[PDB]
């Protein structure tokens, strides 16, 4: 990958369990993969992920997950949605009531899970060869 020269590589940052990193493959969906993060039909890139467990563990919900999304997303879109799922006939206006669940739920960050889906932060890139002239190119050295 270092030898080839890419064009306009776009990086994104996602936080995930780690048990379903395998399922983020095209054509199948995992829990978080169907929840928040989606990948294209044939993405042109490599997946890189280190062990985000020891250091990222401080109960922490600042990286919570969109449990109740209204519908399956479309290719190359974000998840800016910030309201509630539609399931009944009446609007869910007025916080939690009958037949509506708020997607704000514990995604298992307690200290007792030292073996349970500890944070396994994954970074994935997407490249382009021959689509546009390259900017970041590999080294040759030797003086």
């Amino acid at each position: 990958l270092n030898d080839l020269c890419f064009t306009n590589v776009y990086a994104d940052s996602f936080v995930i369990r780690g048990d379903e990193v395998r399922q983020i493959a095209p054509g199948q969906t995992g829990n978080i993969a169907d929840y928040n993060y989606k990948l294209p039909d044939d993405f042109t890139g490599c997946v890189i992920a280190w062990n985000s467990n020891k250091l990222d563990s401080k109960g922490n919900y600042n990286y919570l997950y969109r449990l109740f999304r209204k519908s399956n997303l479309k290719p190359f879109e974000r998840d800016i949605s910030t309201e509630i799922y539609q399931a009944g006939n009446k609007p869910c206006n007025g916080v939690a009531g009958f037949n509506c669940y708020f997607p704000l739920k514990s995604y298992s960050f307690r200290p007792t899970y030292g073996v349970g889906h500890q944070p396994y932060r994954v970074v994935v890139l997407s490249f382009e060869l021959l689509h546009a002239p390259a900017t970041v190119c590999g080294p040759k050295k030797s003086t």
Epitope: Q23, T29, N31, D34, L67, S71, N72, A87, N99
Partner: nanobody, 126 residues
Framework: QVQLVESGGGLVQPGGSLTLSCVAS????????VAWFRQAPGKEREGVSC??????????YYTASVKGRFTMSRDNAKNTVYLQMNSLKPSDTAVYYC?????????????????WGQGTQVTVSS
Amino acid sequence: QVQLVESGGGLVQPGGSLTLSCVASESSLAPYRVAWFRQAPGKEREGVSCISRDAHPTSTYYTASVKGRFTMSRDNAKNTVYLQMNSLKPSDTAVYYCATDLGGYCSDSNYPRAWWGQGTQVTVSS
């Protein structure tokens, strides 16, 4: 706009077997997830099992009380999902409903609940 018809339920002895059919009409259930629900009198509707548009066991989900005993099968040609009934117990006695939505993939906690059928009555006793 889609309506569902549950059928196949009835009186069975403990440890019996059955097969519930959720007939879908006026719409196609192939691109949409289908879930099974049961509601015996005295308790709220509870999710039984959910099958997705891809019919993949990663996307196929069963609840704890039904793991290892209940099974689905969908044939998009006839537009109906099955609910195979195995080792029926008196605790399974409930009015079994099926539900579907515009979503196509199930989860362990996300079952379609938009459109409901009339439900089928399943009783497990003598």
